[PDB]
A paper describes a structure:
To understand the structure and function of the C. difficile eut bacterial microcompartment we have determined the crystal structures of two proteins with homology to BMC shell proteins, CD1908 and CD1918, and show that they are well conserved between species. We have also determined the atomic structure of CD1925, a member of the EutQ family of cupin barrels. The sequestration of ethanolamine metabolism within a BMC is thought to protect the cell from the acetaldehyde produced as an intermediate in its breakdown and to prevent the loss of this volatile compound and its carbon from the cell.
The structure of CD1918 was determined by molecular replacement to 1.62 Å. Three protein chains were present in the asymmetric unit, with each chain visible in electron density to residue ninety of the polymer. CD1918 displays the canonical BMC fold with a four-stranded anti-parallel β-sheet flanked by α-helices, and forms a hexamer with molecules related by a crystallographic 2-fold axis. The oligomer of CD1918 has much flatter faces than CD1908 and it has an open pore at its centre. The faces of CD1918 are primarily negatively charged, with positive patches around the sides of the hexamer and a positively charged pore. This pore is 9 Å in diameter and its boundary is demarcated by a loop between β-strands 1 and 2, with the amide nitrogen of Gly41 and the side-chain of Lys41 forming the boundary of the pore. Electron density consistent with a sulphate molecule, a component of the crystallisation condition, was built within the pore, and there are a series of water molecules above and below the pore. The presence of a sulphate ion within this pore, and its narrow width, suggest that small polar, or charged, molecules would be the most probable candidate ligands for transport through the BMC shell by this protein. This protein may be a channel for water, or a conduit for the transport of the ethanolamine substrate, or for the exit of the acetyl-phosphate produced by the phosphotransacetylase encoded by CD1920.
Author numbering:
A (entry chain C), D (entry chain C): 5 to 90
B (entry chain A), E (entry chain A): 4 to 90
C (entry chain B), F (entry chain B): 2 to 90
The structure:
Amino acid sequence: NALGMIETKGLVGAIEAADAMVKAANVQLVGKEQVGGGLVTVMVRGDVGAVKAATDAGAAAAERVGELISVHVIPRPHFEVDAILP
Amino acid sequence: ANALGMIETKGLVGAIEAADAMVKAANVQLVGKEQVGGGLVTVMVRGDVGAVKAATDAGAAAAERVGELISVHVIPRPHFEVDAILP
Amino acid sequence: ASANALGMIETKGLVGAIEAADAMVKAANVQLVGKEQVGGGLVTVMVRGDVGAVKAATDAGAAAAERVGELISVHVIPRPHFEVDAILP
Amino acid sequence: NALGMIETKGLVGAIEAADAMVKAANVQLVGKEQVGGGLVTVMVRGDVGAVKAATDAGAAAAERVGELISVHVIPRPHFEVDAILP
Amino acid sequence: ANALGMIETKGLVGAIEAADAMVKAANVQLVGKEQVGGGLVTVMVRGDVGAVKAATDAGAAAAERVGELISVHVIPRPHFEVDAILP
Amino acid sequence: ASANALGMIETKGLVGAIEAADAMVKAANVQLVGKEQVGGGLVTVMVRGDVGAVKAATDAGAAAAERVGELISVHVIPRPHFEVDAILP
């Protein structure tokens, strides 16, 4: 139940990232969050290997259409963290 | 009619002009606009792949004329889970 | 078929937008249909009417915004499609 | 029925402006608007002379505690403009 | 107990530390916080003039320690119409 | 009397905040009480608990935020007044 996250400056890069992630591997899109300042984060859940593959694909995609700001995976997130996810 | 075209501008005027140019350039459907702060506005259309490419190219040119274009992209066949984060 | 003409003025700041709006409705027989704000301090005011009225209004509004130092964008769409009409204030 | 407007970057300057305006002359506070980007506008209504006096006082005050961005008076605003005021 | 003290910071942490320092420095009442975008957060207290001056000075020092202070001001006797635009 | 200790981490970006939050709750017995966003991309995550637990959590969270490049502010208030408690998530 790993968590993968990609943050972009702009919604277009985030949607491209999200689409590339769920196409690339056996992950599920948890949703998107807009925190202001133009930053948009999209997130997926799945096995750690699938989430690594998905986030690599998403980050490559975001970078080509937009502004990749960050990409990270948390392999075993703590249950409380779900409270602040989309 | 599943392809998705997206145009993002800094400013609303650019996005409205983009949306109007899109729907006039080809038979595509305007599905909404989203604002994410810092002035960034995105407008999106759906349609068949060819129409969406033509529309998004036209929209991008229109946004460049009146405003500030930030991003332009077409996804020919979005994953079904992606529909759930669209406006 | 097309929807009524649309004139739009975008300013950095609300004061410029209100000055623009006031000048627009004073200059011509147009309807002020609202304002929208998209962050970063950008505010857009919009009018609808006949094409000539909207052109005259928007030119007056742009001048007023530029006078007080706020003008980012100005544009008229003489014959907007209804699809777009549907995403306006 | 003149309209006076002061825009500041920050709420503190706007509240100081508003307080100084209504203290300075026979004007009424219409309200405040926050348009994003940190910009806050406060507005008053009254006779043109009162609104000129009020806005001068408010602008002087905003400048001392904060960031005055703009100050302007519209002497005879058109009725449609009320639709987009606070 | 009508005086108004206001502290504005870029960032929420600075504002929370300011608010805590204010209410600990003197007998003043925290009346709320407001966010106006671009990261700017304002916290406000009410109290008697002396207390509010002391509290706001303490709050400002606390905000400077942990964050970014933007503005600090005390209005001893706000106009009654000003209450209507406060949080 | 005072309310439970409070630890806060502010980051530029949500990814840094989630990394911080995860590290905080992993490092100590604290309650994650929420996140707040105030524009400009700034996100704050907060935990409550006993003072020592909150100190340990917040130190772990700050490290994690700094590792991924996002850290703006970090602070613990060991004994917050309830008035403040009242304006938190």
